[PDB]
Structure formats: C-alpha cells, structure tokens
Design a protein around this ligand. Structure first.
Ligand SMILES: CNc1cc(N2CCC[C@@](O)(CNC(=O)c3ccc(CN4CCC(C)(C)CC4)cc3O)C2)ncn1
Lengths: 236, 201
C-alpha cells in the first residue's frame, strides 16, 4: 500500500495510519523536580545574564511567524546570547518550525557553541480534518526540534493531531523526552507561557501573567549537596 | 527515452556533462559517517559536478548523522537552496514504528535550483510512512512523489543500485550491471566521450 498516493487521493496524511514500565524513573524525576519557577520578561529587551545560574538544559521556543496563518525572526533569534547562560556541559532543544529554521536553527546552535546530536520531528496527523509557503515543494505536516550538546528509551518522533489554527502550543511530550535524558536539574524554557509552566523548570517569557523568580532562591535549589544531581536520582 | 537506463561507473570520475539536463536529481550518497560499503570523502562529495546536471529543478538528497550538516553544505555549494525536508517514518507490516534517541525516520533534503516552472508543488506532503522492505533500501514511494511533482520529465539518480532503475530515470552507481543507454542524445555523446567504452581517471 502506498500512503503517499493515498494522501493525494483522499487528503489523509500518511501519518494518520501509524498504529518494562519506565514509570519509577518518572517518579524519581517528579521527586527530584524543583518547584516551578517563572518570570515575565520581554526577552528582546531583557539581559539574559540576569538569569542564573548557568543551565543544564535550555528549551527555546521563539514565536515564529510561520506559526501564525510579537513574532521573532531568525535575525532576532540568532542575536540572543544563549552561550552566556548555558553551562559548559549543557543541552539545548530548539523548536525550528518547518521552513528556513531547519537551516538557520543549525547556524544558531553552532553560533552558541553546540553541535546537533538529534533531530526530533513532531509529525502532525489530520485524522479529524482530511497554506503553502511559496518555496514549498510539498505540504508541510511536521515541525523539527533540534537537540544540541556542548561540552562532554525514547524515539526521535512525536505524533499528535494537528492543533486548531492559532494554537501554537508544542506537544508536552517534548518535556518527557528531555526529562528522561537525566541531564541535570537547572532547566530553562525560553518563550514559555502560563500554560507551559511545569515543576522542575524555570519558565521565562513575555506573556507570563505572574512571576515568582528569585535568583538567590533559585540557586539555593542546587547548592551542595545537590549541585550535580541528574534529576533521575533519589533526594539526598 | 522513457524506459530505464543506467551506467555502471565511479561517479567521482564519470564525465556527467554527456548526460544532459534533468528536472530532478536524487542522490543517496555513501557519506563517510563502520559501513558495509565503500564511501566518498567529504571533499569527493563536495567536488561532484552536480552543477552541470540541472538549470531549473529540484534535488533530493538523503542525509543521516553528520551528513545532515554536510549534506546542507554540499547542497548550497552545488548552487541549491534547501526548500523542504522529507522524512520517511519506518514501519513494519503492521504499521508500527521500527545515540541519545532511537531513530524512527530517515531524512531527505529537498533543494531547488533556478526557477522551476510547471511542477506540481504541494500535491504530496513531506512525510512518508512505509515499510522497511530490505535494509539499506530507500522507500519506493519517493519515486511516485517525484513523478507526480514532475510528470514525464528526465530524472537522474546518483549512487543507485539495480533495484532503483525506473522509467524516466538514468541511474548511476558502481554496482550496476554494465551500461544500458537508449536516449539517442545520450548515446551519441557517450560514444564521442568514451569511444572505447571505458570510464577512467
Ligand atoms: C566510489 N565511487 C562510487 C561509489 C558508488 N557507491 C558505493 C558502493 C555502493 C553503491 O554502489 C550503491 N549505493 C549503496 O549501496 C548505498 C547503500 C546505503 C546508503 C545509505 N542510505 C541511507 C538512507 C536510506 C536508509 C534511505 C538508504 C541508504 C546509501 C547508498 O548509496 C554506490 N557508486 C558510484 N561511484
């Protein structure tokens, strides 16, 4: 059976036809998680260096114009000083969209000192409703989240139904993949929202309605004996 | 000439200027990324005379690992802008998905050169769901997507194998069985350039 031909015939995307416990690890993560912390900040005007300490993981979700049938261009994104807040050994997860971001996002990762080790594709089904950028050759039915590393169970796919138009949320499954890597407990989500705040994460974005961020309180979560925990180990 | 054609050759050394111009180029290169096949160095890949193969059309370039980046470099060096990226989600016969993460997909960059006119852009989507028939093989769905994109035009595949030969395609690779050319324009230029039939240096 040829699902590409089938999509041409019917409008059903090929991904519509895709069909141990690992839960105590999820409980360890839940126990090790710091309280959720969050800060309203206009990131274009805000000095990211005020965000301390340096982070083990950064999730970067700039609002791209393609997400909308204040937008951030790749010009803006590239000029963020992410390397100033990333720990010497640390990771980045950059939502790149489906167009020029797959290239410019790679320029960014290298600009900030990372190399890409994974390309995580969010594949969007249209089971419930069987655009076209001018340069597009094909209908774009996925988004890419690039994983970068600096210094020294899951699959690289996330499958969900395409969200309603104007809904720009990314699948919460991305957090599960990140937290299952056990990369450390200083986790920053840039351009998060009230709706994405999550235990174990510091969320910073322009549309947050409330803040509770305190740099000294936040650093106190990782003071000794807890400086090097992976986030998948028992409390000390 | 619509029926399949192929040239057994070392693609590093073939004079590809004899083959004419193509609406679509596809390559599945043996990138140098502990492999059961011979590879091409990054420089050999960069030096491939891709630019003579098209004036206006599309390039499909399979990439994995660090060739996701090297493939982008080559694509740009050869004069293409990357405008799409197909992924093939690998399944079994029951339609279930087969370093830091397990890998459920393969990537194919789509580049454009010039200003192609009369192509059927947007008929297919950029996700392929298909069974891994044989290991190391690419999914046959890609040929159908390319045919609907550009029906009836001449196409060329680099680093293909005998199972890849297709109507409207000329296939190049060093495990093909001899030389099989039917297009009279190509036959004429091949005899001129290779009067003794040997492709060296
Ligand atoms: C030295 N100069 C040469 C060398 C040369 N080749 C070297 C020997 C082999 C061959 O003969 C045929 N190609 C392959 O077997 C071949 C196998 C596997 C792959 C990797 N893919 C990755 C993506 C995918 C999984 C969708 C599909 C697999 C690519 C290949 O290309 C081409 N051909 C002409 N000149």
């Amino acid at each position: 059976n040829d699902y590409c031909q089938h999509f041409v015939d019917t409008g059903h995307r090929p991904q519509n036809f895709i069909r141990e416990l690992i839960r105590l690890k999820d409980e360890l993560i839940a126990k090790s998680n710091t309280p959720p912390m969050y800060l309203q900040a206009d990131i274009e005007a805000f000095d990211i260096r005020e965000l301390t300490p340096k982070f083990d993981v950064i999730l970067l979700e700039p609002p791209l114009e393609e997400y909308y049938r204040k937008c951030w261009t790749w010009d803006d994104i590239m000029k963020l000083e992410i390397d100033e807040i990333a720990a010497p050994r640390s990771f980045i997860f950059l939502w790149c969209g489906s167009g020029e971001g797959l290239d410019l996002g790679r320029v960014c990762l290298r600009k900030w000192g990372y190399r890409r080790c994974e390309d995580i594709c969010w594949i969007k089904t249209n089971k419930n409703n069987p655009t076209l950028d001018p340069k597009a050759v094909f209908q774009r039915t996925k988004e890419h989240c690039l994983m970068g590393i600096k210094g020294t169970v899951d699959i690289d796919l996330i499958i969900t139904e395409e969200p309603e138009i104007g809904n720009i949320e990314k699948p919460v499954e991305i957090f599960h993949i990140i937290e299952h890597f056990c990369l450390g407990r200083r986790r920053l989500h840039l351009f998060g929202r009230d709706s994405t705040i999550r235990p174990g994460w510091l969320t910073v974005g322009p549309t947050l309605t409330n803040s509770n961020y305190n740099a000294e309180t936040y650093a106190s979560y990782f003071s000794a004996p807890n400086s090097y925990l992976t986030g998948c180990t028992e409390e000390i | 000439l619509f029926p399949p054609q192929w040239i057994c050759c070392d693609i590093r050394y073939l004079d590809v200027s004899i083959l004419g111009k193509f609406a679509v180029v596809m390559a599945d290169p043996p990138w140098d990324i502990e492999l059961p096949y011979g590879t091409l160095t990054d420089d050999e890949m960069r030096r491939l005379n891709i630019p003579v193969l098209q004036d206006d059309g599309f390039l499909f370039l399979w990439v994995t690992g660090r060739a996701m980046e090297l493939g982008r470099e080559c694509l740009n060096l050869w004069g293409y802008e990357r405008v799409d990226e197909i992924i093939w989600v690998k399944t079994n016969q029951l339609q279930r998905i087969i370093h830091w993460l397990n890998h459920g997909k393969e990537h194919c960059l789509v580049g454009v050169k010039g200003n192609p006119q009369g192509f059927n852009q947007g008929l297919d989507c950029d996700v392929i769901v298909a069974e891994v028939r044989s290991t190391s093989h690419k999914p046959d769905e890609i040929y159908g997507m390319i045919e609907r994109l550009s029906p009836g035009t001449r196409k060329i595949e680099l680093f293909g194998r005998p199972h890849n030969v297709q109507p409207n395609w000329i296939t190049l690779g060093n495990q093909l069985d001899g030389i099989h050319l039917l297009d009279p324009d190509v036959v004429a230029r091949f005899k001129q350039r290779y009067p003794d039939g040997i492709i060296s240096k």
